[PDB]
Amino acid sequence: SSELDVNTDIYSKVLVTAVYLALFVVGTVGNTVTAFTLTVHYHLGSLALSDLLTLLLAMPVELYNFIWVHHPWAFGDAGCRGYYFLRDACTYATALNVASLSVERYLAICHPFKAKTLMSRSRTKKFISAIWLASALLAVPMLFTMGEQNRSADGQHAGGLVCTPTIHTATVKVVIQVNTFMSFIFPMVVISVLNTIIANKLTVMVRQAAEPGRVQALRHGVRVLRAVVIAFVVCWLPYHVRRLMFCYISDEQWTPFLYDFYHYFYMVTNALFYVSSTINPILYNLVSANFRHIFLAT
Amino acid sequence: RRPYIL
Numbered sequence A: 001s002s003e004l005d006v007n008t009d010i011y012s013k014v015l016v017t018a019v020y021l022a023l024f025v026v027g028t029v030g031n032t033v034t035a036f037t038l039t040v041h042y043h044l045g046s047l048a049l050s051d052l053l054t055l056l057l058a059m060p061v062e063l064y065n066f067i068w069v070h071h072p073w074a075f076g077d078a079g080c081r082g083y084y085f086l087r088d089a090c091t092y093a094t095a096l097n098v099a100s101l102s103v104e105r106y107l108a109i110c111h112p113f114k115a116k117t118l119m120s121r122s123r124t125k126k127f128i129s130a131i132w133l134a135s136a137l138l139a140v141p142m143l144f145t146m147g148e149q150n151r152s153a154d155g156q157h158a159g160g161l162v163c164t165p166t167i168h169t170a171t172v173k174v175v176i177q178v179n180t181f182m183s184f185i186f187p188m189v190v191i192s193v194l195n196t197i198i199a200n201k202l203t204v205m206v207r208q209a210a211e212p213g214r215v216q217a218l219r220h221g222v223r224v225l226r227a228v229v230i231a232f233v234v235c236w237l238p239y240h241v242r243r244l245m246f247c248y249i250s251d252e253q254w255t256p257f258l259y260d261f262y263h264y265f266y267m268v269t270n271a272l273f274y275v276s277s278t279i280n281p282i283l284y285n286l287v288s289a290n291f292r293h294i295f296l297a298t
Numbered sequence B: 001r002r003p004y005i006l
């Protein structure tokens, strides 16, 4: 009867709940005000919207049923699939928005004229809409996977229902490997290379120019441009490696210490995953003074 | 035991 429970401490529950609440209150306002403020502007707004949707959708249900001391699920078979579908859609949307914003900034800084030629305002709106639709399409597989199951040994216990994958482990493993490849590795490489080359362009700018604030502005620009990659990697690697550890490890390797450590690493990885939704407006203000002024006024 | 929360 009790084989289906998780034994993380109640104090840990309250602490992680406090962290989640703080991140939620910061991020909701941070993204909402910047979205209201509003071709890099379209990409910035799309990224803010994706972060806001992530924080609004994943945070509450996860904190209630997933990130807690209680095992039993209460969203019904349809909800089991819906929660994960929205979470995956939001994750892909955030990653693709970051990659597209990096590409747009690359084009604007390095190749201005053709950037506007090929990335007109209507073209930009169509591109962001297509990115959102692609993110939604890539999250379809989670619908038929993350169902509900009466995992209790008796099969009819008071909390048998749990939101867990239903497919045979091989297909769950392969789909989550594809998720890691398409949501982290590809955006990671794109972001890293493009941000590094843009930072090198700004560094050669600084070297050639050598101004009171011009050098300072370029230095802070490159600092933030590489801190973007640092933050992306830090926030997103633990989550995907936790999913891969969940999928790949064999039954014989599992041990109670591993089980409890995994259910702690869940909280750690999800906190780091949510930190991304709140970091963005902070950097947006740190990078542009005019944007900071409009943000504060709004 | 095998964890079920993804």
Ligand SMILES: COc1ccccc1C1CCN(c2nc(C3(F)CC3)nc3ccc(N(C)CCO)cc23)CC1
Binding pocket: A038, A040, A041, A098, A099, A101, A102, A105, A109, A195, A198, A221, A222, A224, A225, A228, A283, A284, A287, A288, A291
């Ligand atoms: C690579 O850019 C990324 C990638 C992923 C996540 C966040 C960012 C931000 C980096 C800082 N930032 C800006 N960066 C640059 C650089 F890439 C260094 C040239 N020039 C800007 C010019 C304006 C501006 N606004 C806040 C628009 C306000 O109307 C932001 C940036 C916004 C994107």
